[PDB]
Amino acid sequence: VNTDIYSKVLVTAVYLALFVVGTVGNTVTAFTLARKKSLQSLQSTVHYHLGSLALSDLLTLLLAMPVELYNFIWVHHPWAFGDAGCRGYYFLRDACTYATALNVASLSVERYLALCHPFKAKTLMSRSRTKKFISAIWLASALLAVPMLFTMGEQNRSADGQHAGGLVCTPTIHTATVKVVIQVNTFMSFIFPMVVISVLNTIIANKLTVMVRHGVRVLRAVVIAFVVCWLPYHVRRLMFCYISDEQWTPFLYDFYHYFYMVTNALFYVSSTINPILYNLVSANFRHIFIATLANHTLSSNA
């Protein structure tokens, strides 16, 4: 894995910057939503999905890159764990991205229901229902990451395991199983949730255009934000799985390494940009978030 020394330092520094920015933003968002110094409606569950998304982004930020900065970014030949700690790490990261995608899609669904067909949200979508739905989504996020627990493992990927030349995470499962897992991941985290978010936000924008902060001009960046970062990372998961053992070259190796670095940077940027969007869109939320993070009537007688 030959890569530029200066470029590696730059990407590591920017990854630390996204780490601090995302962690601070998500922590402030979670802290701000905790206090309820306001009158809250009995059928207002928008803050639930915001809190779930902030927690999922924070978990991804504290769980994915510290492993990824060492075993994938700095040094790839060694490893920080064996088989339990590597498969566990990949399962945790997959569950985190599944949770973030599910939370974004569920938030879009809730906003659709509230702003377009309010009767369904009022009659069906209650706080207890929202809490049960969030719990079920979090439980199913790990359920959709079950194959990563079995697919991942430790492999020498060399002539013998008696040398430190190579020992890193690698799917030891069959090629068909790896392809099935990758396709399931792509379908469940790149096509379905992004398509749902795009459709629902576009319909909300069309509905809000009837009335005629940005207001309606934020759902044009919300869906754009999802697509610019998610897709380049989710195509790397497909550019290194279904690609046959051909057209390999050192230039291709460097291009693949740079592409992975850029895609992971975009993924972390997307996982960090949600608190900024929350601050920009709202006003009363922005005031709370910023504060802890930065003639005349006369008189006569008859």
């Binding site: 894995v1 790839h76 995470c169 690698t170 790896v178 790397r236 998961r237 053992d245 390999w248 693949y256």
Partner: peptide, 6 residues
Amino acid sequence: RRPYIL
């Protein structure tokens, strides 16, 4: 092919 599946 040396990706280690990323």
